[PDB]
Symmetry: C5
Subunit: 211 residues, 5 copies
């Protein structure tokens, strides 16, 4: 039985990653919707001598590919699987105001469901540009960082949020800084060069020293 | 004796050939074919406790054991070889993660597992971890207390079940001249429930109580 | 229709990349690279070591006949995205760095049907810079030269579109404000050598914000 | 000149015979044990940090072993008696500092010397941070620290460790270091765990040092 | 022209149709010429006795197996190629305290006579007591470079000059250079009859007087 459930899963992955191989990313003809959400774990550091703030968070990324669809009946009623993030295409979602390379804290493994949808949730430590003036007051400090594709326009990758509230439910209760509010908002930009719209998600965090 | 050693080498190379190079890559556990992973921790040192950022750095050994039927063999068919060492990259390993780490975990030991003929794998990486921890009280008699949870990043308890052999962290090789002394260290399996999800989620909670050595 | 356009792109790349990589330029077949810097932040000015850390976007453009194709032979595809590790890229180097350059963006280029490539890496650079005067009204001045490490001007020619560094996205709440930022193409000759060598000189004047 | 082409060809063929026309040595077993000889040479104590009780050491770790599968007859190969090869082309032992606090940083090219009798010589230069309380380093007695080295996964039934001498080589120790070495020993130890019938072997590096005046 | 096609053919011919050069032996020794160019002394830490240095290490050698006749290949006399496509010598700083950090592209120039020129830029931390750096005579520091595994019977070292090149030393460094020499030395070990060759880089420096 368990030998057969393995054989089914092994066959499924072969059928997907070895027939009509590596999806080449989205195009204007075949656009992609990526949904972004953030879960904030901890503000680790606020350096007022370089105006850098260090953040630990989960970035939840979701998208759907027809080329990852399968009928569970063709494959022993397998409805989802786990696979390495290097085995599939992933979107190039970038923090636009980072000051150091993003550091990856979690295994980089995705979950693929039979409808072709992919959930990928990397935990990261990010240093970005932020003046924490007022962090030692009641008002606190406010900082913003924008995330988006580095090379794809809104005509190839459409970004969405399900909610504009950052999930704070697992924020570390004994951090040096407390979160007054945290929002994530979709924005459309245009550039004078270019006709296409460009999408980002603006993460706005207001925070202050713990009392 | 030279031939006897060549024979034993040929059998080991043939064993590994038959397991790794001519039998499909194990795709991981499913709800249909679940896996039990046993965790235990050996604490070697608390290196640093930073109250300016609430980060603490530990050095520990993390013992991982699991068992796959697809790694079984009969010693009799392979010159009575009962186990072998292999690179951890040659086999599937569980995605056990420190959930509250603040920096990438740093591996201190070679990445090599021991595989036994019953299909059990023993893998013991030595790691330095920075994690979230408020060390207030560390310079008092009562000490500070810190907790870090370990578990799969992507699997539920229907795919990867975690166990412990004991709830006591092994402190028998804890460094005698550390800046901090350990008052207590426990490791407890926890069943977690998320309101999103019907499945159980498992983690092992490592709770360390410690203070400055006088 | 979506399956066909995928298959078109897949085959274009295979035709371009799986059938003899460009071995770089020669005197007989020189390459022109255009550079433009966008300065995002001056992160740190260390007066104990005379190192300054910048964050900037570096726009790199060039054109290869070996990356050309006719859109009509490939389902009207006019450009595509690809990993910078699928194509040759110029060896443009900051000549006065004190640490390995740190890459902040995904390393992906855009290739257009006319053979043009656009590659825009975001980088954090530590380079040699005496920040004396930074706490005064005149500010400090620092200069860093970029260019090819191994190719002369006869193989890789560097150009800028403009001599003005783009400051439109510079961080409003940086510790340092920018008084001026220029990027100037320069030609040099060494006594050893008859060939010209090109560099772009990034000159930044800055001071502590008030 | 031509004869240089031939000795090249000979060495190319020797490496090909050893590494591509033969399966990779799977490591030692209880049936086919291996002796690894270990020696330490000490360059510099870089840092003694009494805020974290970590000390930084730069040292050469000399490793020697011998494999039948790396043997050849020099007469068959243009009278070549040894060669150099990337360490990644051959099996190497998993010798580890047991009390490191950071990943070891390698300072030398990872290249070994193989001799026609099958002996391999591999001498990696490393910077190691390890657990060490430097109390007394500012005194005449100095501080004493110890670190154990050995296989991470093999028992003494598979890898026997040995030393040629119990004196650490201090002949190259940096003369202008912040710290002078009073003494440095390296001692083979046989260890027993109550879990396990097999003997386990480590080499215990004991270093006595103080601030130089 | 496709002096492009000529270059591509030459590289195929040298690399993938004449196996990877195995390195030198007693029967086929190799001379490496070494020369240093100092860009900056970045840091001198008297709490650990480490000094951090930024420099170019010019490496030159010559292999018969890299020779060709320019007339067989459209009069191509040289080319650039990745340092990972050819053998390079294992020249090491013997007294480093941290891994060397590479600042430049790893690309070599190969000439038709079989000569290779490779010039990596590096930041090196090495053992050095900077006592007297704040005095008139300054501090003196020495670091030896040489092969890690080859003897003088396999790799002979030489320099072209005993003067280190200071003509591009950073003029606003915290430290000025009083003198900088590079001298071939021979060492023996009592175990062993063979000579061992190194190049000793001796730098005398002091705090720049402001
Ligand atoms: C390829 C690199 N890429 C990175 C960029 C980076 O964008 C941002 O940093 C950004 C985006 C929205 C809002 C604020 C942004 N931003 C800043 O610009 C500074 C600060 C750190 C910040 O958050 C992503 C979006 C787009 O590419 C898909 C860019 C724009 C598309 C187009 C635009 O030309 C003007 C613009 C680019 O300049 C070059 C491109 O030329 C084809 C680009 O480098 C980025 O512009 C900021 C911008 C392009
Ligand atoms: C895929 C990433 N994964 C990481 C997570 C991370 O979990 C934790 O950090 C965690 C787990 C137990 C107890 C405390 C935890 N925790 C925190 O949440 C913050 C703090 C650092 C910490 O220790 C592992 C367990 C499970 O995945 C197998 C997660 C949960 C399963 C499920 C849950 O949805 C609410 C939850 C996820 O949010 C997303 C998933 O969606 C299908 C997940 O990202 C993590 O939740 C925190 C949580 C999931
Ligand atoms: C191969 C390494 N390469 C790095 C160099 C580095 O050049 C620079 O750093 C530089 C270039 C222009 C202006 C100022 C420069 N400069 C400095 O020289 C120091 C300071 C950091 C700085 O900005 C690139 C240009 C050329 O290579 C295409 C070089 C020159 C070509 C030629 C010149 O010989 C005198 C010179 C090289 O010395 C060796 C070469 O010998 C064939 C070279 O290493 C660099 O010289 C500075 C210089 C060569
Ligand atoms: C595979 C990982 N491995 C690392 C170990 C680590 O050993 C040491 O750190 C060590 C060895 C001798 C003396 C002191 C040691 N040591 C300490 O234990 C703390 C301190 C840092 C230190 O120096 C190497 C030796 C042996 O494996 C060949 C171990 C022992 C063999 C056996 C022993 O079980 C009790 C023991 C292991 O615990 C697990 C094993 O279970 C099959 C092991 O993880 C290490 O135990 C310390 C110990 C094993
Ligand atoms: C393989 C590693 N290798 C590194 C060595 C390292 O040498 C040096 O560090 C060195 C060389 C010349 C002068 C001073 C040196 N030196 C020091 O010894 C300390 C200080 C950092 C320094 O500059 C290179 C030269 C030779 O290998 C080609 C070595 C010598 C050849 C021979 C010598 O043994 C007696 C000696 C080795 O000890 C081991 C070898 O055993 C067969 C070696 O590890 C280095 O010895 C210091 C020495 C060998």
């Amino acid at each position: 039985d368990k030998l057969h459930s393995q054989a089914n899963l092994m066959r499924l992955k072969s059928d997907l990653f070895n027939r009509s191989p590596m999806y080449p990313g989205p195009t204007k003809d075949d656009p992609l919707t990526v949904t972004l959400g953030f879960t904030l774990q901890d503000i680790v550091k606020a350096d007022s001598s370089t105006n850098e703030v260090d953040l630990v968070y989960y970035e939840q990324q979701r998208w759907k590919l027809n080329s990852l669809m399968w009928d569970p009946n063709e494959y022993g009623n397998i409805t989802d699987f786990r696979t390495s993030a290097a085995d599939i295409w992933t979107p190039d979602i970038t923090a636009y105001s980072s000051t150091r390379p993003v550091q990856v804290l979690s295994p980089q493994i995705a979950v693929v469901t039979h409808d072709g949808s992919v959930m990928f949730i990397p935990a990261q430590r990010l240093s970005f540009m932020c003046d924490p003036t007022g962090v030692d007051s009641e008002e606190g400090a406010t900082c913003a960082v924008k995330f988006g594709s580095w090379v794809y326009s809104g005509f190839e990758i459409d970004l969405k949020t399900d909610t504009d509230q950052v999930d704070l439910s697992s924020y570390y209760a004994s951090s040096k800084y407390e979160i007054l509010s945290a929002t994530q908002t979709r924005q459309v930009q245009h550039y004078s060069c270019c006709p296409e719209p460009y999408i980002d998600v603006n993460l706005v965090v207001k925070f202050r020293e713990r009392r």
